[PDB]
């Protein structure tokens, strides 16, 4: 994985030069926008079960997915879906802290598509669940922090689709 | 005919007709005598069938004679009787042919939009074909009714 600072360092390293002025400006932008990422990660780590619980109430409860025959029917499948949503929320928090979505490729999206297609997991239903996660965390954490969280959760949705 | 379907399949797959389908033509030639008999009895006794079917349909559906329908005048009444006569006629045609393809080329392909343009209800006509089936199978003998029933049955299926 890499953050924004590590991405700038790696780009300047494979170019083979020192940090020029544009790299300094990108670093200054990240250093300016870091504190809001810190407080957003604090809020998400505070309420991390509540976004998952509320978003499952927003999208998946009392529906065909949790009804008999659905993919979230049994308790083991419900616990697996809650585990998957916890993974998505935690890794989106990691990507929001890093300012880069590289960890989502390295850890999450490298095999999730083929894993879900082997498992029979409804990718559309997971997309609606992650959009519900996005809406709940955007209501909870603020405006621009909610925008950043929505960007990384839409990256997770784009990796699933 | 089934001969036409076998010969079109032979021309499609670029080879002579095979053993099982030739036995199909042979079975068709064996049953063609009773097919001709069915055509003769339906052609000679079509009138009671169309009369019973039209009174049964128009007592089951009291809206075409009622205001708010499409069969007010005697010319529309004769048009509905003409549609009954042509449908029973095409069924006798397909019974002679052994299968559905004359009915598909004469009265099936485009029948839904055909009657949507003339505002005649398609479920009304599937009720018409079912009561005409009831009249025809009541008039015709038992194994003859079992032989000629899937042609009408495919008519209700293709209508809806």
């Amino acid at each position: 994985m890499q953050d924004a600072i590590t991405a700038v360092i790696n780009s300047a390293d494979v170019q083979g030069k020192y940090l020029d002025g544009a790299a300094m400006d990108k670093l200054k932008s990240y250093f300016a926008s870091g504190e809001l990422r810190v407080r957003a990660a604090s809020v998400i780590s505070a309420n991390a079960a509540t976004i998952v619980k509320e978003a499952v109430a927003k999208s998946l409860l009392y529906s065909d997915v949790t009804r008999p025959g659905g993919n979230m029917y049994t308790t083991r499948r419900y616990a697996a879906c809650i585990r998957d949503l916890d993974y998505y929320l935690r890794y989106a928090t990691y990507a929001m802290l890093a300012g880069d979505a590289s960890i989502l490729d390295e850890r999450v999206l490298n095999g999730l598509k083929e894993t879900y297609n082997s498992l029979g997991v409804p990718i559309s239903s997971t997309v609606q669940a992650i959009q519900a996660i996005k809406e709940v965390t955007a209501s909870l954490v603020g405006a621009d922090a909610g925008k950043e969280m929505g960007v990384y959760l839409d990256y997770i949705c784009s990796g699933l689709s | 005919s089934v001969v036409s379907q076998v010969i079109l399949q032979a021309d499609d797959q670029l080879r002579y007709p095979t053993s099982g389908e030739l036995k199909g033509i042979q079975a068709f030639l064996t049953t063609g005598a009773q097919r001709i008999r069915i055509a003769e009895t339906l052609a000679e006794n079509e009138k009671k069938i169309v009369d019973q079917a039209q009174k049964q349909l128009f007592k089951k559906h009291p809206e075409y004679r009622a205001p708010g329908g499409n069969a007010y005048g005697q010319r529309q009444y004769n048009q509905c009787l003409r549609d009954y006569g042509w449908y029973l006629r095409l069924v006798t045609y397909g019974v002679l042919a052994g299968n559905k393809e004359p009915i598909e080329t004469t009265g099936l392909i485009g029948v839904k939009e055909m009657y949507n343009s003339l505002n005649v209800p398609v479920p009304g006509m599937v009720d018409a074909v079912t009561v005409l089936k009831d009249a025809a199978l009541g008039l015709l003998s038992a194994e003859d009714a079992n032989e000629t029933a899937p042609y009408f049955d495919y008519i209700i299926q293709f209508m809806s």
Partner: protein, 49 residues
């Protein structure tokens, strides 16, 4: 069960057409920017919106 899977990629069927989607997809299938036709489309629709 079934012994193979082709993969269930996400399908997004368009439930109904609205005129911004219509104009954007109209030039998108033609592989071009929205020229003055689609610009007047969106202009009139955004004025009447």
């Amino acid at each position: 069960s079934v012994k193979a899977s082709g993969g269930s990629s996400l399908a997004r069927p368009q439930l109904y057409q609205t005129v911004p989607v219509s104009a954007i997809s109209q030039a998108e299938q033609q592989d071009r920017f929205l020229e003055g036709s689609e610009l007047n489309e969106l202009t009139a629709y955004f004025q009447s919106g």
